[PDB]
Scaffold this active site. Structure first.
Site, PDB file in Angstrom:
ATOM      1  CG  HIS A   1      -0.486   0.463   2.491  1.00 50.09           C
ATOM      2  ND1 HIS A   1      -1.148   1.355   3.291  1.00 50.09           N
ATOM      3  CD2 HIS A   1       0.689   0.197   3.122  1.00 50.09           C
ATOM      4  CE1 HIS A   1      -0.400   1.633   4.355  1.00 50.09           C
ATOM      5  NE2 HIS A   1       0.703   0.910   4.295  1.00 50.09           N
TER       6      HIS A   1
ATOM      7  CB  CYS B   1       2.959   3.280   5.771  1.00 45.38           C
ATOM      8  SG  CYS B   1       2.857   1.769   6.713  1.00 45.38           S
TER       9      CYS B   1
ATOM     10  CD  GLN C   1      -6.867   2.131  10.291  1.00 43.07           C
ATOM     11  OE1 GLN C   1      -7.606   3.057  10.591  1.00 43.07           O
ATOM     12  NE2 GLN C   1      -5.722   2.311   9.661  1.00 43.07           N
TER      13      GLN C   1
ATOM     14  CB  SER D   1      -3.716   5.559   8.691  1.00 43.93           C
ATOM     15  OG  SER D   1      -3.972   4.600   9.653  1.00 43.93           O
TER      16      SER D   1
ATOM     17  CG  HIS E   1      -4.648   3.101   2.977  1.00 43.69           C
ATOM     18  ND1 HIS E   1      -3.607   2.613   3.741  1.00 43.69           N
ATOM     19  CD2 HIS E   1      -5.538   3.641   3.849  1.00 43.69           C
ATOM     20  CE1 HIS E   1      -3.862   2.834   5.023  1.00 43.69           C
ATOM     21  NE2 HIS E   1      -5.028   3.456   5.117  1.00 43.69           N
TER      22      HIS E   1
END
Ligand code: 4BL
Length: 145
Positions: A41, A95, A113, A136, A139
């Site tokens: 991702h 990330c 998630q 977050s 993505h």
């Protein structure tokens, strides 16, 4: 049509395409559940992210909208082939899995998630999501196994 796919009408062209409301993927071509999947991702964070902080940038200040703009840019380059996913995940992902070309290893339902999990299980091997939103940030998800 597989889990999530609906016919839509192209606004520009008036040609039909297929949109996936779970992965947010879209494509012209007509489309075509395991215990575990594997995915990488590319996360673009923003000011409302759970943790507005990353290895790339200590305080993230970009808005939601700017993040979505970045995500769209990268989806276009990946799709045109001008750049490949692993390369942009390595350089641009907020990330720290950026260090592994954005790879997160294999996972089952129950660990990620939920919007990210749903998107990841609705992808087929080889497929890429459109923008997936979680707390977050935003993505792009690539299903690798
Ligand atoms: C669902 C999901 C899975 C993995 C990650 C990793 C991050 C992060 O590093 O911010 N966020 C996630 C959300």
């Amino acid at each position: 049509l597989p889990p999530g796919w609906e016919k839509a009408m192209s606004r520009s062209s008036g040609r039909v395409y297929y949109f996936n409301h779970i992965t947010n993927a879209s494509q012209w071509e007509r489309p075509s559940e395991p215990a575990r999947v594997r995915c990488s991702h590319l996360l673009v964070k923003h000011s409302q992210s759970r943790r507005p902080s990353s290895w790339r940038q200590e305080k993230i200040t970009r808005t939601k909208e700017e993040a979505l703009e970045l995500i769209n840019g990268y989806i276009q380059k990946i799709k045109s082939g001008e750049e490949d996913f692993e390369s942009l995940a390595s350089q641009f992902s907020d990330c720290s899995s950026a260090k592994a070309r954005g790879d997160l290893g294999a996972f089952s339902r129950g660990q990620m998630q939920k919007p990210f999990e749903d998107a990841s299980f609705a992808l087929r091997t080889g497929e890429m999501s459109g923008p997936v939103f979680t707390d977050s940030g935003i993505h792009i998800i690539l299903r690798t196994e």
